[PDB]
Amino acid sequence: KPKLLNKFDKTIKAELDAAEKLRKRGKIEEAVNAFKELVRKYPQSPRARYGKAQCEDDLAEKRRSNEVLRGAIETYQEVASLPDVPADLLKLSLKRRSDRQQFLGHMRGSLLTLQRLVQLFPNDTSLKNDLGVGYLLIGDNDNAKKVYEEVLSVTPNDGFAKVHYGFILKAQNKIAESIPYLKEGIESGDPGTDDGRFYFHLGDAMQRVGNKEAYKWYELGHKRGHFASVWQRSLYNVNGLKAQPWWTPKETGYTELVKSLERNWKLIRDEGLAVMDKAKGLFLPEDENLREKGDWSQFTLWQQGRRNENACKGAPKTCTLLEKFPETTGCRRGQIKYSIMHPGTHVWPHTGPTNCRLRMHLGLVIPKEGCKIRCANETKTWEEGKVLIFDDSFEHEVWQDASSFRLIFIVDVWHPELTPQQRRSLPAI
Amino acid sequence: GKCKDGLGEYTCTSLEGF
Ligand SMILES: O=C(O)CCC(=O)C(=O)O
Ligand SMILES: [Mn+2]
């Protein structure tokens, strides 16, 4: 179907097919020089230049190299600068340049490529969509909101634009507004609406309004391969890992870490209380929209495997103790943090992002009544000087209805069945 | 913006190349 040969490229069509054939055969080295010869002899051929660009692309994948891939990205832009580029070829070339610039994290760059695709093709809705994604990738939810509004002002039936529209509304805590969009969009069946994120957030938005349909959708998404179960709905998983809401210390193998936490708990407690008395701002309010009501704040010492050096100035002995346990200080999918919660607080049901961590809680200051935590079907209480362990990739929930503050210490560990090699390579969360 | 306790961000990992 797609017509990629302007008038002059039709007269050299035999040489261009010759060279693209070598490329399809796998001979990356042969074709790249066959396209570079064509580009030398035909410096205005948009099809020679695209062939060069694609061969650079295949290479940077044979080679897993970032410098050559960066070259393919300029060659893709070279295609669009030439005279008389056929439209199918100009779109294809610049889309790939955006998609491979997103792969490097040049998302400031992928953004400009996408804006140009939309200037050049103002009736293509897919490119307004793909540009909404460019805005979400860099955290610019405001500009992404307009984009999907515009798309919806023109095509209100477009699924993709609807789910993304909802996703934005949910993230803004416009929970009920979010739900028809999330629902109709998943229901459209358009390409790119069958994504776990939308199943996840429709069910969660239903739960918060008290619509008991919410688990119908958790079950749909389980059917279609997004969640491991209806209860355990994390999205950045390593498939297979033993899955259970509550673990005993021995079942994790981290008995040394647990012993240390429990034997040295009072120095951990005392540095946290010192930080509450003299250095409160180190405690930051929870900021993932997880509270229905009340006050909940966290003082973080490690995140994504990296010690916070200024934070460790306010808990120096605790940081020194934990340095001996890399199963937690190098868990690049978890944190190490004090967590304070006061009366009047209800944490919505919610799930962590990854099944690659287990979460330990050490009780530091626990009132006798009013504080409890549910993971899955079972609710439990903290104790001062004692560690509980649960998989926060399962749905969990917390209440604080006591008459003073409740303080715990939270230590994330690598899932025990994860290999040394998985631990070193998995991308941070 | 990061995914610490939940899944509220469009993507939780950061693309940084090969
Ligand atoms: O501080 C708390 O009680 C809440 C912790 C929570 O939701 C978690 O530990 O994943
Ligand atoms: Mn949690």
Author numbering:
A (entry chain A): 330 to 758
B (entry chain B): 99 to 116
Paste lines from the article.
Aspartate/asparagine-β-hydroxylase (AspH) is a human 2OG oxygenase catalyzing post-translational hydroxylation of Asp/Asn-residues in epidermal growth factor-like domains (EGFDs) in the endoplasmic reticulum. The human 2OG oxygenase aspartate/asparagine-β-hydroxylase (AspH, BAH, HAAH)13 is highly unusual amongst human 2OG dependent hydroxylases, because its Fe(ii) cofactor is complexed by only two residues (His679 and His725) rather than by the typical triad of ligands (HXD/E⋯H) found in other human 2OG oxygenases. AspH is of significant interest from a cancer research perspective, because its levels are upregulated in invasive cancers (e.g. hepatocellular carcinoma and pancreatic cancer) and it is translocated to the cell surface where it can be used as a diagnostic and prognostic marker. Thus, the combined crystallographic analyses reveal that the C3/C4-substituted 2OG derivatives bind AspH in the same general manner as 2OG, with near identical binding modes for the oxalyl-groups and the C5-carboxylates.
